Design a protein around this ligand. Structure first.
Ligand SMILES: CCOc1cccc2c1OCC(=O)N[C@H]1CC[C@H](CC1)CC(=O)N[C@@H](c1ccccc1)C(=O)N[C@H](Cc1ccccc1)C(=O)N[C@H](C(=O)NC)Cc1ccc(cc1)NC2
Ligand SMILES: OC[C@H]1O[C@H](O[C@H]2[C@H](O)[C@@H](O)[C@@H](O)O[C@@H]2CO)[C@H](O)[C@@H](O)[C@@H]1O
Length: 518
């Protein structure tokens, strides 16, 4: 619909210091008359791209940087353009976290990493290895306690162990991440996940443990250890637990490697308050007194602002956060991440419960994460074939056989669709406002309403791609060939994330090829 002009609405996760952030809003209001309203809706990272796609939602959205690439792919975020003087106040690697396609798409706030939190009056000398946690639990269970409890429902918490001995999402390569090479099902990951499942099999942990259960158990003193981030420290300070924060245990001699998030603030593209949003973020929040105000509600961890981080670095809890972050890896921000997470979430839940074995669970995850790449391979060269004088090399034997037969199929069925629905395609394109690269993103938004609503079948999918080819022809026509590849990425993103389960159910492009058997 429409975002309200002349005020700021902010969405931040319910575990962060939202009250502290609203106090920064009060100072902003005092100085300007502009009211700032902080909201903490459930599933805001899932809701944001739904409401933002219809030109609605908050002015500012807070989340870890990994989600932001997807938002930017669908044109939901304003480009941010701070001057050099302001960029110098934050650590360069935080700015890297929020750079997508050579554009800054958010303001970095804080560096979040998981640590091992332990009760000093149950266990003054915590274990340096995962391997020694079973023996600790055996001893503590005879005392009516347990060794370790943490959220097994979110793969963010289990990933440090899965990655320890070689598991990886998409291989880092000199700042860049190659989607061609995914490592969710390599030996390192199997070993890590197997060890977790053994803990559950031998009753050292419970597969149904979640954030709420773990937090309560630790804060009541029922378990000697938990895994959590700086935001959690606040509720422990309130409890009667003398706790420490330290490096995560090693696995097979190898450090636990958490995926490190940079909590970031992005500006809704549909906002009529962009200049106010930037003024708030640069000049009220990202100051010593601004972050102090948020930090005092719930610890942010290590902060992106150099001046204030220097003060925090003295706290031993922050030293531990940083030790864990340096041993981990900063997450990619690419649009694939969402699918990857959802895929790994399913794998751990199934392996832990018994529903699948570890090998079967990681295999399905490997597929669910790969799909984005193969999809893009096919859609890219279909659109390019259709729109331009490029050589049609797929039949000449350029890419894999699945891509080859998918393209052949698509040439037959897709061209049929374009022949028969010429006027309908003209009508939809004319209703769209496509003359540039920004507007190609506006397709990303619109179509999910047209595409996602209702059932899913290959027919509807061919229609989406076929319409994409029709739009690519238009782009070529108005000297905009450079948008065809971004257009293909939009379609591919919109499709894979929206129909991930179904696509995996159908066995991806092999299914498509089968369905029509051209
Ligand atoms: C005008 C731009 O249209 C779209 C652009 C991007 C995404 C979409 C667009 O379609 C909206 C629409 O109503 N566009 C109109 C203008 C384009 C037109 C569809 C209608 C294109 C078309 O013929 N699509 C047909 C089709 C596709 C491939 C081969 C033969 C037929 C289609 O999607 N039919 C399927 C049934 C089907 C057909 C063949 C194999 C498997 C399943 C369907 O589900 N059909 C649905 C149904 O309720 N009963 C048959 C209707 C439907 C079809 C496709 C979609 C949505 C609804 N795709 C989403
Ligand atoms: O579990 C997958 C989940 O991991 C990360 O979410 C973290 C977030 O970064 C933290 O700030 C905190 O809120 O805990 C979350 C896990 O419950 C990713 O950022 C997220 O995209 C992903 O779904």
């Amino acid at each position: 619909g429409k975002i309200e002009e002349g005020k700021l609405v902010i969405w931040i996760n319910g575990d962060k210091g939202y009250n502290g952030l609203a106090e920064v809003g009060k100072k902003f209001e005092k100085d300007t008359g502009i009211k700032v309203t902080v909201e903490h809706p459930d599933k805001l990272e899932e809701k944001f791209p739904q409401v933002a796609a219809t030109g609605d939602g908050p002015d500012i959205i807070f989340w870890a940087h990994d989600r932001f690439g997807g938002y930017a792919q669908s044109g939901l975020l304003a480009e941010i353009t701070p001057d050099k003087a302001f960029q110098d106040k934050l650590y360069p690697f935080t700015w890297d976290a929020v750079r997508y396609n050579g554009k800054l798409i958010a303001y970095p706030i804080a560096v979040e990493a998981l640590s091992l939190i332990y009760n000093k009056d149950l266990l003054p000398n915590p274990p340096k290895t995962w391997e020694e946690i079973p023996a600790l639990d055996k001893e503590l269970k005879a005392k009516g306690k347990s060794a370790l409890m943490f959220n097994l429902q979110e793969p963010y918490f289990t990933w440090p162990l899965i990655a320890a001995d070689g598991g990886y999402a998409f291989k880092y390569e000199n700042g860049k991440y190659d989607i061609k090479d995914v490592g969710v099902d390599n030996a390192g990951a199997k070993a890590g996940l197997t060890f977790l499942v053994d803990l559950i099999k031998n009753k050292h942990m419970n597969a149904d443990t979640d954030y709420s259960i773990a937090e309560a158990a630790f804060n009541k003193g029922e378990t000697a250890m938990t895994i959590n981030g700086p935001w959690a420290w606040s509720n422990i300070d309130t409890s009667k637990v003398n706790y420490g924060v330290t490096v995560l245990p090693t696995f097979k001699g190898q450090p636990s490697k958490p995926f490190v998030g940079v909590l970031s603030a992005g500006i809704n593209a549909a906002s009529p308050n962009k200049e106010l949003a930037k003024e708030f973020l640069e000049n009220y929040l990202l100051t010593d007194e601004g972050l102090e105000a948020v930090n005092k509600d719930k610890p942010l961890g290590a902060v992106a602002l150099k001046s204030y981080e220097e003060e925090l670095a003295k706290d031993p809890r922050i030293a531990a956060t940083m030790e864990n972050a340096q041993k981990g890896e900063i997450m990619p921000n690419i649009p694939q991440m969402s699918a990857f997470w959802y895929a790994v979430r399913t794998a751990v839940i199934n392996a832990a419960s018994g529903r699948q074995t570890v090998d079967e669970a990681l295999k399905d995850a490997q597929t669910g994460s790969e799909l984005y790449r193969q999809s893009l391979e096919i859609i890219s060269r279909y659109l390019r074939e259709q729109a331009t004088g490029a050589a049609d090399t797929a039949p000449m034997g350029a890419s894999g056989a699945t891509s080859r037969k998918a393209l052949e199929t698509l040439r037959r069925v897709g061209d049929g669709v374009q022949r028969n629905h010429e006027t309908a395609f003209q009508g939809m394109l004319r209703k769209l406002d496509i003359k540039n690269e920004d507007d190609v993103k506006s397709l990303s938004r619109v179509m999910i309403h047209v595409f996602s609503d209702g059932v899913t079948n290959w027919g509807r999918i061919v229609t989406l791609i076929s319409f994409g080819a029709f739009v690519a022809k238009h782009l070529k026509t108005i000297n905009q060939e450079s948008c065809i590849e971004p257009l293909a990425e939009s379609i591919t993103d919109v499709l894979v994330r929206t129909k991930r389960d179904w696509l995996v159910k159908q066995r991806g492009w092999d299914g498509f090829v089968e369905f029509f058997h051209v």
